[PDB]
Motif scaffolding. Structure first.
Motif, PDB file in Angstrom:
ATOM      1  N   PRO A   1       0.928  -1.312  -0.045  1.00 29.61           N
ATOM      2  CA  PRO A   1       0.116  -0.278  -0.085  1.00 29.61           C
ATOM      3  C   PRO A   1       1.089   0.728   0.189  1.00 29.61           C
ATOM      4  O   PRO A   1       2.228   1.655   0.387  1.00 29.61           O
ATOM      5  N   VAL A   2       0.137   2.360  -0.602  1.00 27.74           N
ATOM      6  CA  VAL A   2       0.981   3.645  -0.845  1.00 27.74           C
ATOM      7  C   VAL A   2       0.205   4.310  -0.442  1.00 27.74           C
ATOM      8  O   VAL A   2      -1.199   4.638  -1.271  1.00 27.74           O
ATOM      9  N   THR A   3       1.135   6.190  -0.029  1.00 26.49           N
ATOM     10  CA  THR A   3      -0.161   6.852  -0.119  1.00 26.49           C
ATOM     11  C   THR A   3       0.983   8.160   0.629  1.00 26.49           C
ATOM     12  O   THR A   3       2.021   8.431  -0.135  1.00 26.49           O
ATOM     13  N   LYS A   4       0.903   9.133   1.959  1.00 25.17           N
ATOM     14  CA  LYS A   4       1.357  10.709   1.206  1.00 25.17           C
ATOM     15  C   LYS A   4       3.286   9.925   1.834  1.00 25.17           C
ATOM     16  O   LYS A   4       3.652  10.472   0.580  1.00 25.17           O
ATOM     17  N   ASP A   5       3.307   9.073   2.201  1.00 31.90           N
ATOM     18  CA  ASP A   5       4.359   8.180   2.398  1.00 31.90           C
ATOM     19  C   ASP A   5       5.052   7.662   0.617  1.00 31.90           C
ATOM     20  O   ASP A   5       4.255   6.768   1.090  1.00 31.90           O
ATOM     21  N   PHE A   6       5.852   8.412   0.051  1.00 30.21           N
ATOM     22  CA  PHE A   6       6.542   7.585  -1.527  1.00 30.21           C
ATOM     23  C   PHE A   6       7.768   8.122  -1.413  1.00 30.21           C
ATOM     24  O   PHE A   6       8.361   8.740  -0.728  1.00 30.21           O
ATOM     25  N   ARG A   7       8.191   7.793  -2.397  1.00 34.00           N
ATOM     26  CA  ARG A   7       9.478   7.779  -3.025  1.00 34.00           C
ATOM     27  C   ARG A   7       9.463   8.880  -4.045  1.00 34.00           C
ATOM     28  O   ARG A   7       9.210   8.714  -5.453  1.00 34.00           O
ATOM     29  N   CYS A   8      10.075  10.376  -3.966  1.00 35.49           N
ATOM     30  CA  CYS A   8       9.754  10.712  -4.561  1.00 35.49           C
ATOM     31  C   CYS A   8      10.715  10.727  -5.848  1.00 35.49           C
ATOM     32  O   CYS A   8      10.543  11.247  -7.078  1.00 35.49           O
TER      33      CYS A   8
END
Length: 68
Positions: free
Chosen positions: A41-48
């Protein structure tokens, strides 16, 4: 205000994960591109500096043409 990287990819989701992956390194060779099936799952936290490409057994890819 936004991690200096790739704003958003064009129409990649639904065109094969591999293809979208190449467009990720081709559009932003600085960020790493990944490919996997719906799961982590992915959300606000991610790898720019990282553009992953999801894939749904539905028979289609799902690479978020947009980074944080």
């Amino acid at each position: 205000s936004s991690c200096p990287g790739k704003s958003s990819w064009p129409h990649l989701v639904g065109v094969g994960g591999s293809v979208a992956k190449a467009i990720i390194e081709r559009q932003n060779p600085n960020v790493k591109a990944v490919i996997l099936e719906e799961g982590t799952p992915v959300t606000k936290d991610f790898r720019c500096n990282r553009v992953r490409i999801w894939v749904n057994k539905r028979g289609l890819v799902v690479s978020p043409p947009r980074i944080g």
